[PDB]
């Protein structure tokens, strides 16, 4: 909203024609100022009248508007991703609902919002898993693909997690397999790569495919190190530990993987994840 006027200030100042000369077009001096502050978005025609006085090419304001809108939206995705990581779903639900409430036409961004809405509903208990999955699949079979090639895969990752955590381990696995297959093809966005491999390994672990699980976990660690990310690495070492214990590797290599998990937990002040860990080492 406020960039249009801000770039109108920048330019009219450098043009060399007065702010009250830009008044005598189609509006009071006031409207120019209210536009100047972003307060009022100018009407299509008034703007075209202003487009006569600072030079200037017309597509330069649309240019302006498009960067400001992509940044607006990118900033919102960033913010939403940020609360997901913090598990703040009541806030996610509210935020995305309010954005959808505007019902503005932008199919890909609306898909992003709905994905987040249905998942948050799910976490918040507003909706069954069966229902959440349905809704999520209606998204895949819009079969869109804008600027974000990964968005369907993200939506697929959610579908597989809900299945896996609700007992449907073979469906979830097949799905994780689909995703990895589409990632080998695309690229790159390796944090996600790591994340699907982490869930895949969990589901493999609960299906007693321990080597398979361990393979996937080593691979995810390897990727975590190549993109420099500690996002899931501590829990990758936790999972590595669990696999090496069900496969009965030397206590040494087992406890090793676990101290490392422990290191990341403290380093990352991940107190929930840290708790369980100190439990097991005595317990099991």
């Amino acid at each position: 909203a406020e960039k249009l006027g801000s770039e109108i200030k920048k330019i009219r100042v450098l043009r060399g024609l007065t702010q009250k000369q830009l008044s005598e077009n189609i509006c009071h001096q006031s409207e120019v100022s209210r536009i100047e502050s972003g307060a009022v978005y100018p009407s299509m025609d008034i703007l075209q009248g202003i487009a006569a006085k600072l030079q200037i090419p017309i597509i330069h304001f649309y240019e302006v508007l498009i960067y400001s809108d992509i940044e607006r939206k990118k900033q919102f995705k960033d913010q939403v991703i940020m609360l997901c990581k913090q598990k703040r779903y009541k806030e996610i639900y509210n935020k995305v609902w309010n954005e959808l409430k505007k019902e503005e036409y932008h199919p890909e961004f609306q898909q992003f919002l709905q994905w987040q809405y249905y998942v948050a509903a799910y976490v918040l208990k507003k909706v069954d898993y069966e229902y959440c999955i349905l809704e999520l699949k209606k998204l895949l079979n819009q079969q869109l693909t804008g600027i974000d090639v990964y968005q369907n895969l993200y939506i697929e990752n959610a579908i597989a997690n809900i299945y896996a955590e609700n007992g449907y381990l073979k469906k979830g696995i097949d799905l994780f397999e689909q995703i990895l297959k589409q990632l080998e093809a695309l690229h790159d966005n390796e944090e996600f790569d790591v994340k699907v491999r982490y869930n895949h390994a969990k589901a493999l672990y609960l299906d007693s495919r321990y080597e398979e699980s361990l393979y996937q976990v080593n691979k995810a660690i390897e990727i975590s190190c190549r993109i420099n990310s500690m996002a899931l690495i501590g829990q990758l070492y936790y999972q590595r530990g669990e696999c090496l214990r069900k496969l009965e590797y030397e206590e040494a290599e087992i406890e090793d993987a676990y101290k490392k998990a422990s290191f990341f937990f403290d380093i990352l002040e991940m107190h929930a994840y840290k708790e369980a860990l100190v439990n097991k080492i005595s317990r099991l």
Binding site: V119, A158, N161, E165, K195, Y198, N199, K202, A203, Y238
Partner: peptide
């Protein structure tokens, strides 16, 4: 631990 969204 939990699955990761």
């Amino acid at each position: 631990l939990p699955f990761e969204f």
